[PDB]
């Protein structure tokens, strides 16, 4: 209820900023791809309060996380760009047919989109970030694909066993 909800968002984003400190590289080769489950707070916020609010959370989350981990602008900007895209799409699908069907149809789609958005993004970033030629990206390609497919897929199914578990 306005003031009651502003605080709810504020502590959930500050909750996600916390969870972002258990980030681990999962892939030993790809030390740049690091998994954190902080996209599960925003996915919950996006379902209750709307797609724009969910992106606001991951936006402020990564800003705070960047203020505390000052030294990864492009990486954090990548996580913010991919993160905002994951929740806003999942929020939008859920948000015209309250039917629980749109909950998973949005997560299946959002997981696929954010995965595709990551490959296209890294295509002109992994060359630029490592100041390398385009072939390095292609060495990393199946790991970038498997990562964001697993990261957002896990976040999709974990948020579902949160709604289930009630
Ligand atoms: C080159 C680079 C590529 C990244 N690619 C992805 C990605 O494909 N999917 C994802 O979820 N996060 C990705 N990240 C997010 C990363 O785990 C997070 O931003 C770390 O905080 C990097 O500092 C990427 C980060 C960098 C630096
Ligand atoms: C609007 C109310 C929503 C409920 C919020 C309670 C906490 C967040 C939901 O799940 C939790 O998230 C953590 C971080 O990702 C996980 O580590 C943890 O295992 C899991 O239990």
From Swiss-Prot:
Keyword hit for Cell membrane: yes
Q: What is its main location?
A: membrane
Name the keywords, alphabetized: Cell inner membrane, Cell membrane, Membrane, Transmembrane, Transmembrane helix, Transport
Could you cite one Gene Ontology molecular function of this protein?
riboflavin transmembrane transporter activity
Q: Where in the cell is it found?
A: Cell inner membrane
Which sequence ranges are marked TM in the entry?
8-28, 40-60, 74-94, 108-128, 143-163
Q: Name one GO biological process term.
A: riboflavin transport
Does the record bear Transmembrane in its keywords? yes
Quote any Pfam family the record assigns.
ECF_trnsprt
Q: Which GO terms describe its cellular component?
A: plasma membrane
Give the record's membrane topology. Answer: Multi-pass membrane protein
Task: Return the InterPro entries for the record.
Answer: ECF_trnsprt_substrate-spec (IPR024529), RibU (IPR025720)
What's the stated role of this polypeptide?
Answer: Substrate-binding (S) component of an energy-coupling factor (ECF) ABC-transporter complex. Mediates riboflavin uptake, may also transport FMN and roseoflavin. Probably a riboflavin-binding protein that interacts with the energy-coupling factor (ECF) ABC-transporter complex. Unlike classic ABC transporters this ECF transporter provides the energy necessary to transport a number of different substrates. The substrates themselves are bound by transmembrane, not extracytoplasmic soluble proteins.
Subunit structure of this chain's protein: Forms a stable energy-coupling factor (ECF) transporter complex composed of 2 membrane-embedded substrate-binding proteins (S component, RibU, BioY), 2 ATP-binding proteins (A component) and 2 transmembrane proteins (T component) upon coexpression in E.coli. A stable subcomplex with both A and T components are also isolated. This complex interacts with at least 2 substrate-specific components, BioY and RibU.
PANTHER family from the xrefs? RIBOFLAVIN TRANSPORTER RIBU
Homology family: Belongs to the prokaryotic riboflavin transporter (P-RFT) (TC 2.A.87) family.
Output this protein's name: Riboflavin transporter RibU
């Amino acid at each position: 209820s306005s003031i009651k909800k502003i605080s709810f968002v504020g502590i959930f984003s500050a909750l996600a900023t916390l969870v972002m400190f258990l980030e681990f590289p999962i892939f030993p080769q790809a030390s740049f791809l690091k998994y954190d489950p902080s996209e599960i707070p925003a996915l919950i916020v996006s379902f209750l309060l709307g797609p724009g609010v969910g992106m606001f959370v991951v936006l402020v989350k990564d800003i705070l996380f960047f203020l505390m981990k000052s030294g990864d602008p492009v990486g954090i900007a990548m996580n913010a760009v991919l993160g905002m895209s994951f929740v806003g799409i999942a929020g939008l699908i859920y948000h015209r047919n309250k039917s629980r069907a749109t909950a998973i149809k949005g997560m299946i789609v959002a997981t696929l989109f954010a995965t595709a958005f990551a490959l296209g993004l890294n295509a002109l970033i992994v060359p630029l970030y490592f100041e390398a030629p385009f072939e390095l990206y292609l060495k990393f390609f199946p790991f970038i694909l498997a990562f964001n497919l697993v990261k957002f897929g896990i976040d999709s199914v974990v948020t579902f066993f949160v709604y289930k578990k009630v």
